[PDB]
Amino acid sequence: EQKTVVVTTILESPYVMMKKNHEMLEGNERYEGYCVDLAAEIAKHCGFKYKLTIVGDGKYGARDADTKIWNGMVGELVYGKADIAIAPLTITLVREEVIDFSKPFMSLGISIMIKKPQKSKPGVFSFLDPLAYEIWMCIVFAYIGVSVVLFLVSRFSPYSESTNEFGIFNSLWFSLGAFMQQGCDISPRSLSGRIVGGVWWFFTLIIISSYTANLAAFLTVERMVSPIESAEDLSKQTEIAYGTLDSGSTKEFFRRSKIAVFDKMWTYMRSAEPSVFVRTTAEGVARVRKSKGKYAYLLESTMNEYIEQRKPCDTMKVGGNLDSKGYGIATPKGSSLGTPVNLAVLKLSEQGVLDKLKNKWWYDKGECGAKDSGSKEKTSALSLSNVAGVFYILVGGLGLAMLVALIEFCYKSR
Amino acid sequence: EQKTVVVTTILESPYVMMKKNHEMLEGNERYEGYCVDLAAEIAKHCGFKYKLTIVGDGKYGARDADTKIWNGMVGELVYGKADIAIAPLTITLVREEVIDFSKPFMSLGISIMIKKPQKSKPGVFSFLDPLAYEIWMCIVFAYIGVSVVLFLVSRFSPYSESTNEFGIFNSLWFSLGAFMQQGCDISPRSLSGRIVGGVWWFFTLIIISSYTANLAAFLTVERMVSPIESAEDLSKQTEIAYGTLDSGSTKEFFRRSKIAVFDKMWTYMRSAEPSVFVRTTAEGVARVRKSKGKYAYLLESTMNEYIEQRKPCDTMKVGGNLDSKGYGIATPKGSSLGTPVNLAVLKLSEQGVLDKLKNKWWYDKGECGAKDSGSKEKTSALSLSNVAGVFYILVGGLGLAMLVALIEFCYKSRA
Amino acid sequence: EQKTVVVTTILESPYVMMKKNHEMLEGNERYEGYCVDLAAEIAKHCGFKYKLTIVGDGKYGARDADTKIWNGMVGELVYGKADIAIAPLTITLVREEVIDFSKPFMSLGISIMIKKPQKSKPGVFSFLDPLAYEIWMCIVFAYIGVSVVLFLVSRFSPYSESTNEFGIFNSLWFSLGAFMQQGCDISPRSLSGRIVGGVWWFFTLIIISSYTANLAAFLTVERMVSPIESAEDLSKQTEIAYGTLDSGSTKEFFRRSKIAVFDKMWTYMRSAEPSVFVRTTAEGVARVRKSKGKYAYLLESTMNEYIEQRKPCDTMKVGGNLDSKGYGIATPKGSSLGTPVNLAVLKLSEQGVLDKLKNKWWYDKGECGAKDSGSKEKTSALSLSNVAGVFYILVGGLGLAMLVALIEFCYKSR
Amino acid sequence: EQKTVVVTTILESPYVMMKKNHEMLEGNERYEGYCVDLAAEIAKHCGFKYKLTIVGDGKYGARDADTKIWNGMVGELVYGKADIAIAPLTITLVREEVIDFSKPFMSLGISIMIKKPQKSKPGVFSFLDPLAYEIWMCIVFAYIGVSVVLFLVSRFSPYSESTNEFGIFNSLWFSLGAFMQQGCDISPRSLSGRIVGGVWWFFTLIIISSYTANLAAFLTVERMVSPIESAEDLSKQTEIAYGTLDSGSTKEFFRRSKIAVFDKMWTYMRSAEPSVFVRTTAEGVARVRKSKGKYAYLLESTMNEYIEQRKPCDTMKVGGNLDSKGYGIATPKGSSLGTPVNLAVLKLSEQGVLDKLKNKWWYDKGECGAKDSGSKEKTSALSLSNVAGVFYILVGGLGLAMLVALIEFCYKSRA
Ligand SMILES: N[C@@H](CCC(=O)O)C(=O)O
Ligand SMILES: N[C@@H](CCC(=O)O)C(=O)O
Ligand SMILES: N[C@@H](CCC(=O)O)C(=O)O
Ligand SMILES: N[C@@H](CCC(=O)O)C(=O)O
């Protein structure tokens, strides 16, 4: 008369959590979580008796090669260890053909997860950065031209030789002194020269004012670096390594996806030399955190958004997710339990209690309000590294400067 | 053949479009599009003819208030006006209850679209913008008087008037270099003149500082542009506006959902006035183009990402997909052809023709060059264009002095 | 009552709002008195017809002195012209004298409302602001001393005295030109003088850099700053007049209040010139908007909030609530209706419908919601009025400069 | 008769406090405070004898839900161990059904409480703080090296060393003025020297700009601090924690009210651990005092206004009151004292004796009132202290140069 069933589940942290009294409790009491209280609600509607169990394989597990003999979690259904599965498991025809599935309870998709980027060590020459590259070339050519035009106009028969000191060497010297805003030893006596002298002042005044303003702007609200826009970039580059969780349905999806980017990524991962795949969520997390972002991990975004709130907040989503897929309850073929739980799942889908479960197990567990910069940093003094460049230039210049005197003296040695 | 199957259709690119000269063509040949091809695939695989018909009221339709009447294509299905529905009809519970669907053939999410904001190429002389015309003009007038007074004071009968170099031209040349803080070759000696020098120096000290400060502040403000992202801002931002197509089941979803984000959205849309809703997709996207920044629009991501690649290329997606849905071919309740249709759908799926048709229709029409993809977010770099004008001023200045020196020669050679 | 009642009500937008078709709507269907038809729960139980009736005097009503005449609402209740009032009216013993009350449905208090402040025109001399009076003073004494010390040490006996240009006049000239960062031809050429020269350069360098930095910060962020915040300021009031609603029981409360700050306020409000009070909401509103900078108005915080979200969004709450009191139903003494309606108000408080009663009007009409610092209009060009001071100084100095030459000329006339 | 009625009370300032000589005094004189004073007016109106008694567990108490056994003062009132109680217990319906109350004698508001923000005392040389110690150090060495190289290269024979003025001391004088951008009297002649000059010029041009930019940034970040205001954003801020007294009426209010912001507050108060709850006002205040900046507390505003006026003055109100409440004297149901007590309360209210008590217990007690008035420090201006040290450096510099001339005299005076 009486009847009981065995249930399969998995200790996924968003879905099932190990109760502190884990030493001796039964699976119907050992556990709490979205799967646990979903199962309780299902048994409340359908009335059937059950016991919770972990997946005996403790994993999703891969298909047996060349046979597709099922993994632990599916085999426990097919071979009578269990008759119902309530787990975060991907809906697909390659599974629907062997076992029945309920209506999906959630809709979700693949995402990348990456280490949150951090401030890099500043560049040795980064003191140039505000003013952009090309302008320095324009400045150089302008200085040349200005010196030449000054020299010519100064000496093009002002009525004559020796009438003033403006030699070409001295003309370059005047041109250089006028820029860095320093002592002026001489001045153009002639109108055309005073004219040439004039505009160069306005030009330097504007340039310097712009530079000093912009550098001041730069030091406020840094808001920099964004190394990857989407997996597009990850498909163009090859330095950063990546891979899926092993045995995952992502691997089968890529195995047959005809999209050129995804087909290229698949053929690479098939061709990848090191061990790109990870067996566990913990391994996938640790590998990225170890790699300082040099390796990136693919997972269903609903795990990422759970880990995102579990401090430290050193991980982030990027990209607009990969696809859309359902999660649902599963049932082996011919099992009488199938439709009486499927109708209960339909009830919950239309009654909306799942929104209560989602609130209870994700949104109430949000912690990391640091996303919105809830606390304001304080500026600190410049490090020596932020200006180090100028000292090398200085000392090198002095070193060169000594050499000239010796070579001049050796020329004048006879 | 028993009878030609009555097909309901609505004009929507790329699903269905009018032919270039449709008025010249056969009634079915009048139309072209993704679904028109698929209709031929259905006719092939199931082995019967079909008749294309435009949906009379031009909408999917919804349940009428307080009457439970059905209008739109669904109305035509529930009242037996047609035999099969061929349109990007989304599958939802409140309609599944009365019409039958094949296996889904495509998956989608909802998306948000906005106008591309600007083309901010700086003006040729915009570096002057901190000071405005009047300040420069008054500086110009002020410049003269200082020299004039210096000259007048410098030259008088010492009751020895030759004992100073402050001629008129030198009295100019002193003052310009003084204003630029470049120093001088000579310094005034009379008590009167030093006062003038002092006040002109003070004037300089104020002006140059003010200019530098203002330019710095201006760039500082520009750094904080902080554009809207991820639609989360629409929980709090209200300077923007947004809305949806009318009679779309998007509206039913929004008014039926209770998720606090989307509850807030429906609360806004239920109460904001004047009506943010729109009756047609064509004028809806035009509403964004007309609103030019103030009104955003919500639509299926498939449509957003079709449109945004079209020739004008003046709009873009923002944020990710809000949810997930799918299309299915639909037919009245108990239509015996429905299972043959489901088999045809399954075979066309397995054959990959669902890619074939999409690969024809989407990628060739991707005529926008997709430049300025945002892959280099300014990097705070001060572009050369922003300062270009000064180089023209410099070159012109140098160009003039040649001609000056030439006429100076022509003078010195005959005076 | 004759199985029929005329509910005393007042048209006030936080509680009752006229329907558009008031030319043809009649009875309760002329309005949306959700603020009443819940408390009418006992009217539902008794089944008597209730008409939402406009208070005859259109005002909260009052009680006279001497004659003790009862006005408006109060009059029509005590004279038996009306029978039940659900009007938003203040609980006070002066009314408990002749009528009785239910438990108050909500609590509120005295509030004060002013026109939102605005940026005035810039000050003529406001260009001085970054350094303040003390520093601007001290610079002068520093300049004096530096010149004096230079003159002293430069004219120790060289061995013949006055072997260099550094007279006192020239010393003042040199030190002034050194302050302004200007070309000075003469040089100390002496140890003590060079020492003195150095420090003055370092001093000016620091001063100027500080000034420019601070002004740069000043232009980035603006804050209007409210001129007053407290009742103490209103006791120290300069010109801004203030007053309560006329005929309002807050006025009698102020007449009753003995506490020294409020007694001083009252004795001012007694001794202020006539027309300091206002009789209606609209009169107070217009007076405040007319008072660009001359008057401030006091009202109940719930009405302040109800206005604060309306258009134009040009008013603000200032300060805290001055007191607290309840609003509740009022009825003639010992009424066979007034007794049981308290049961309705009680159990409606247990049901918590007060939250809906608030939300439907105060929060659904939030309208002019949050404004913050996120994005602003371009700072735009600096106006001439922000620097006008310098031009006056300049032209004044030039005008003076000629005078010295004429008097010098007349001195050298013999 | 009257068997020496027992009054229950809990110690709290200014309500009731111990006498400083309670180690040796006896009777009700062992105490001071608002309520124990008012007890004399109660005895005046009742005509009865009474004794003060300390509440054993020292708290108001709670229903103890899932058990429904009252404790605290309410416990003593329901189990008949307390004849009458006088304490700042607020009247609530969940209490009124257990105990009687007089007319309310005083009105209250709930308040938030925080530590004072520490005053930003300037440093004597804080003007240096933008530029870091190592840079200031290394500038000196670079200045030395440049000067030495300029000297050496200038005076090596030109083929004769008398041909130029660049002596060692003159070489030190050139470089200093060049670094300060003050110009100079003389200019280097040889190509090597001009190279050195240009290098040193570029170096200063970089340094001075960097210094100015950093100082401007440093002030800018400061300005926009925007401290917490009205404290309602404790519903939104999370870096700063806030507490509430155990068993207090507030502990019910946040469970029992259902306004959304207070809902998320109660969710915080439920979830946060170490718990927000505290057993005593004294140690909660101590917790705030030690947990400066990061911690806050909820209390009756009347208590904050008592506490914040004490000599330490390190704490203050923030924001407006949360609600409105009152206090009444309490007694078991149907006590024949109740109506006499209500009459006494009414009389004392009408007589204004409430103020005659209150004035002694707050207005003489206030001993901190220093607030910005007449003028305000915070507006924009820099204080003199913020740059003060430079003036000391200047004065000392001028003070030194006298002695140089004095030793120059002491040399020359015996040539
Ligand atoms: N292990 C999950 C997810 C794997 C994946 O993301 O592909 C499943 O196969 O159902
Ligand atoms: N017509 C679709 C929505 C189309 C859209 O919002 O883009 C529906 O029934 O929901
Ligand atoms: N609502 C107040 C009138 C306004 C006032 O007192 O200022 C009353 O019930 O009397
Ligand atoms: N004395 C108040 C304390 C209120 C509180 O702090 O929660 C009471 O009766 O509970």
Swiss-Prot record, chains B, D:
Site (Crucial to convey clamshell closure to channel opening) location in chain: 228
Cytoplasmic side: 185-190
Protein family per UniProt: Belongs to the glutamate-gated ion channel (TC 1.A.10.1) family. GRIA2 subfamily.
Subunit and interaction comment: Homotetramer or heterotetramer of pore-forming glutamate receptor subunits. Tetramers may be formed by the dimerization of dimers. May interact with MPP4. Forms a ternary complex with GRIP1 and CSPG4. Interacts with ATAD1 in an ATP-dependent manner. ATAD1-catalyzed ATP hydrolysis disrupts binding to ATAD1 and to GRIP1 and leads to AMPAR complex disassembly. Interacts with GRIP2. Interacts with GRIP1. Interacts with NSF via its C-terminus. Interacts with CACNG2, PICK1 and GRIP2. Interacts with GRIA1 and SYNDIG1. Part of a complex containing GRIA2, NSF and NAPA and/or NAPB.
Highest taxon of source: Eukaryota
Glycosylation: residue positions: 2
Protein name per Swiss-Prot or TrEMBL: Glutamate receptor 2
Intramembrane region coordinates: 166-181, 182-184
Any further remark recorded for this protein: The postsynaptic actions of L-glutamate are mediated by a variety of receptors that are named according to their selective agonists. This receptor binds AMPA (quisqualate) > L-glutamate > kainate.
Cysteine pairings via disulfide bonds: 313-368
